[PDB]
Each structure stands twice: as C-alpha cells, then as structure tokens.
C-alpha cells in the first residue's frame, strides 16, 4: 500500500525547458524542418489529461 501511494504521489520537477524555434531557425536548420517540428510539437502540447472523467468514476 505504501509503495502505490509513494508511486502515485511522486513529485516530478525537472524545469521543463522552453524551445525558441526562432533561434534554431536562424542559426542553421533544414528548410521546412524547424517549422515542421514546431507545428507538430505544438499540436501535442495542446493535448492534456481529462481529470474530470476520472474524478467521477472513482
């Protein structure tokens, strides 16, 4: 029981770094790559957990 609690209650802090696509876009990059990564990267960042649905079932 204690393991599951510690497992669920483990805190995650790693200082999620910010990406400056303009910097990489300027210094050097393959044409269409830096932009393709940004648009695809941003799309997944929008997705987030649906805490509401889980809150109800439990």
């Amino acid at each position: 029981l204690s393991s599951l609690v510690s497992f669920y209650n483990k805190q995650h802090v790693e200082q999620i770094p910010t990406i400056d696509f303009n910097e990489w876009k300027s210094v050097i990059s393959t044409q269409g790559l830096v932009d393709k990564v940004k648009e695809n990267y941003e799309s997944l960042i929008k997705e987030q957990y649906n805490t509401d649905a889980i809150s109800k079932q439990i």
Partner: peptide, 29 residues
Amino acid sequence: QVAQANYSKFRADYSASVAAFQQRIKTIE
C-alpha cells in the same frame, strides 16, 4: 506554462471530488 495547466487541472479534480458531498444528500432523501 505546463505548471499553470497543472494547477488548473489539479483544482478541477478537487471540486469534482467534493461534489461527492452531493451524493450524501441522496442518502438523506
């Protein structure tokens, strides 16, 4: 920015759980 989303979602689950207090009213009825 993800931390801002984390805190917002965190409070959501709290309010959703406290809603269980409404279920207690069902028993009284």
